[PDB]
């Protein structure tokens, strides 16, 4: 039927790992990340999910060059 | 005390399979001291781990 | 505030945690140098002024400077198995009786003393 | 904290516990209360015959649709069982409190089981699986067992 039986036909993969977003939303067949729109230069970003914007903003990661450059520009250098 | 390892790989040295390797029961510390498929090949050469004959599936009927 | 002080205290770096762990000099070692109190250093002989081990003199073995305590060499404590351990008296409960020299301590000690004189 | 009742003489008494006794509170309840005034030797003699299934544990208060048996008439009932795991688990808690009677210098052949007390522990959890995808609990319900002893002067 359409429950435990049809759950057995779950062989393929719709999504694989996104080289840019690092998560598992890279739709294989039409090759685009379902969560950052890779290979689109702009990452997908929609105001109708501000909560998901917040999971993806700056500072949510390492923020290497900024934790440095924000120190240089706040000390009269650049 | 358990002879699972010495029985698993002696069946992989005799190349027969289980229920064909006969691990001598009257001595296990002899077999248990094997713990290696070269120390078992020596054991096979000695009395302790014979391979029992396969079977007689008659065909005279 | 209450909230920011109990954070700058417990979140204080190590070199800050040493001036927050200063102990008063004895009654006859202050006017020896004319200052009020010093941060405790390893190997500076002291005397406890408060606690179960009060009035017990000893040489500071270490400044265990994240427990917020100093370790005195004669203030020990027994575990269950005989092995003796060292209890940590907060420096403010201690009164320094000895110092350790330095061309950076009897120079800052008269930086504090040049305030008086 | 310890021990609902004090033995009313502490040197003429032994004490023993378990905390996570690993089996049913309800089987362990009557396994324990069945020996609650007996001498220590008459209590092991009970349990060691419950295991040979010649005497039973009269289930009171947690009988609840257990089968009737002939061996429960002495206990004034019709119901009773032979819980092996809860009996072998107090063969051990008693022989502990024996070792506490020798340790103080008390003949265990004089010990009376005063005040057994069984109660409930933290009730471990391991889900099971119902029809239609309903994940129901399958609580384990361990138990604590207390008991102390005493002597009877001639």
């Amino acid at each position: 039927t359409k429950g435990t039986t049809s759950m057995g036909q779950r062989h393929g993969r719709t999504h694989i790992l996104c080289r840019r977003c690092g998560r598992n939303s890279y739709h294989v067949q039409w090759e685009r990340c379902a969560a950052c729109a890779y290979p689109r230069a702009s990452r997908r970003r929609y105001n109708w999910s501000v909560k998901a914007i917040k999971r993806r903003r700056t500072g949510t990661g390492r923020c290497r060059y900024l934790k440095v450059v924000n120190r240089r520009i706040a000390n009269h250098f650049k | 005390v358990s002879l699972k390892l010495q029985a698993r790989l002696a069946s992989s040295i005799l190349g027969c399979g289980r229920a064909r390797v006969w691990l001598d029961p009257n001595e296990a510390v002899e077999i248990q001291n094997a713990n290696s498929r070269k120390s078992v090949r020596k054991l096979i050469k000695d009395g302790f781990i014979i391979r029992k004959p396969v079977k007689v599936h008659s065909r005279a009927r | 505030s209450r909230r920011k002080a109990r954070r700058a205290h417990f979140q204080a770096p190590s070199h800050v945690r040493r001036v927050l762990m200063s102990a008063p000099l004895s009654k006859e070692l202050r006017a020896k140098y004319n200052v009020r109190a010093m941060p405790v250093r390893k190997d500076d002989e002291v005397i406890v002024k408060r606690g179960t081990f009060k009035g017990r003199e000893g040489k500071v073995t270490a400044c265990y400077r994240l427990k917020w305590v100093i370790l005195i060499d004669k203030v020990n404590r027994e575990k269950a198995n005989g092995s003796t351990v060292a209890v940590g008296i907060h420096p403010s409960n201690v009164e320094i009786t000895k110092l350790k020299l330095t061309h950076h301590r009897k120079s800052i000690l008269e930086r504090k003393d040049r305030s008086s004189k | 904290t310890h021990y609902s009742r004090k033995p009313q003489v502490s040197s003429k008494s032994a004490k023993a516990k378990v905390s996570d006794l690993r089996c049913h509170y309800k089987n362990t309840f009557e396994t324990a209360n069945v020996i609650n005034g007996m001498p220590l030797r008459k209590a092991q003699q009970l349990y060691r015959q419950v295991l040979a299934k010649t005497r039973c544990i009269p289930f009171k208060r947690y009988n609840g649709k257990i089968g009737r048996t002939a061996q429960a008439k002495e206990w004034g009932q019709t119901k009773g069982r032979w819980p092996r795991k809860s009996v072998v688990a107090m063969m051990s808690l008693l022989k502990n409190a024996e070792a506490n009677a020798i340790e103080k210098g008390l003949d265990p052949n004089q010990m009376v089981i005063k005040h057994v007390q069984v109660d409930q522990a933290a009730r471990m959890r391991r889900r099971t699986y119902r029809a239609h995808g309903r994940i129901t609990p399958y609580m384990c319900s361990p138990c604590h067992v207390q008991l102390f002893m005493s002597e009877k002067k001639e």
Binding site: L17, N24 | - | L66, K67 | -
Partner: protein
Amino acid sequence: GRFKPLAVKKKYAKKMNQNKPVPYWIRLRTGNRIKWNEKRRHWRRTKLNY
């Protein structure tokens, strides 16, 4: 089963190492908040799929 990219292989190896217990020199540290690892995966319970 036998085909995994090397990149997908580098990511399960980074998970086989993260699946070790907290060593018993961590819980005697002065003020740690760690008693268990609380990120241990079991291959049956939860899957990584990467």
